[PDB]
């Protein structure tokens, strides 16, 4: 579950949502952007300087995007495996899925 | 879980992934496109003329996008509630989540 820099509307840190199993086999990748604007939504997952940011930030699961791999840039961090349960929790509530 | 026409790169049918609970409260909406090109991936959910298409089609959960509501168009169908378990199954495998 790596964290790259990606070219969205502008350069932002993103969470690779697409499974790393099939990543070298696809021309596109689904990502979740990371913005410093914390809005206090359930669909957010906190990330901080431990993950690889300057100021504290959040993974915005309501704004997931599938971008070309050409727009995927430097690898700058990782989502800790202890945060994985909350990621599934964020996506399930974001889309109303029966996890 | 409605099915609208949306303006992506071109006009396509889409599955509203964003929960309808918060839909009239957001300027963006996360959708999953529907293409007739069936590739036989686990991350696909079959839809047909019952849902509101001409030829049989599939929900491509590897290409989900968050688009402005301004690009959301006519309501043309519905995802049957019996297909809901497969939708959660498709997204969970698409992102490797512990459903």
Swiss-Prot record, chains A, B:
Biological process annotations from GO: mRNA catabolic process; negative regulation of DNA-templated transcription; negative regulation of growth; negative regulation of translation; positive regulation of growth; rRNA catabolic process; symbiont-mediated perturbation of host process
Domain of life, per lineage: Bacteria
EC assignment: 3.1.-.-
Expression induction: Mildly induced (5 to 9-fold) by starvation, when grown in a non-replicating state, in the presence of isoniazid, gentamycin or rifampicin.
Description of how activity is regulated: Digests 23S rRNA in the absence of Mg(2+), increasing Mg(2+) concentrations decrease its efficiency.
Annotated family: Belongs to the PemK/MazF family.
Stated name of the protein: Endoribonuclease MazF3
Keywords recorded for this protein, A-Z: Endonuclease, Hydrolase, Nuclease, Toxin-antitoxin system
SUPFAM superfamilies: Cell growth inhibitor/plasmid maintenance toxic component
GO molecular function: DNA binding; RNA endonuclease activity
Disruption phenotype: Individual deletion of mazF3, mazF6 and mazF9 have little to no phenotype, but a triple mutant shows increased sensitivity to oxidative and antibiotic stress and starvation, decreased formation of persisters cells, and a decreased bacterial load and pathogenic damage in infected guinea pigs.
Keyword set includes Cytoplasm: no
PANTHER family: ENDORIBONUCLEASE MAZF, ENDORIBONUCLEASE MAZF-RELATED
This protein's record includes keyword Nuclease: yes
Complex and partners: Forms a complex with cognate antitoxin MazE3, possibly with 1:1 stoichiometry.
The organism of origin for this protein: Mycobacterium tuberculosis (strain ATCC 25618 / H37Rv)
Purpose: Toxic component of a type II toxin-antitoxin (TA) system. Acts as an mRNA and 23S rRNA interferase, cleaving predominantly after the first 2 Us in the sequence 5'-UUCCU-3'; in 23S rRNA only cleaves once in the ribosomal A site in dissociated but not intact ribosomes. Cleavage of 23S rRNA inhibits protein translation; the 23S rRNA region cleaved is involved in tRNA-binding in the A site, 30S and 50S subunit interaction and ribosome recycling factor association. Upon expression in E.coli and M.smegmatis inhibits cell growth and colony formation.
């Amino acid at each position: 579950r790596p964290i790259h820099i990606a070219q969205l509307d502008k350069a932002r840190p993103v969470l690779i949502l697409t499974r790393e199993v099939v990543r070298p086999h696809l021309t596109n990748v689904t990502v979740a952007p990371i913005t410093t604007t914390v809005r206090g939504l359930a669909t957010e997952v906190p990330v901080d300087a431990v993950n690889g940011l300057n100021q504290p930030s959040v993974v915005s699961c309501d704004n997931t995007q599938t971008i070309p791999v050409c727009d995927l840039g430097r690898q700058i961090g990782y989502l800790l495996a202890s945060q994985e349960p909350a990621l599934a929790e964020a996506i399930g509530n974001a889309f109303d899925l029966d996890w």
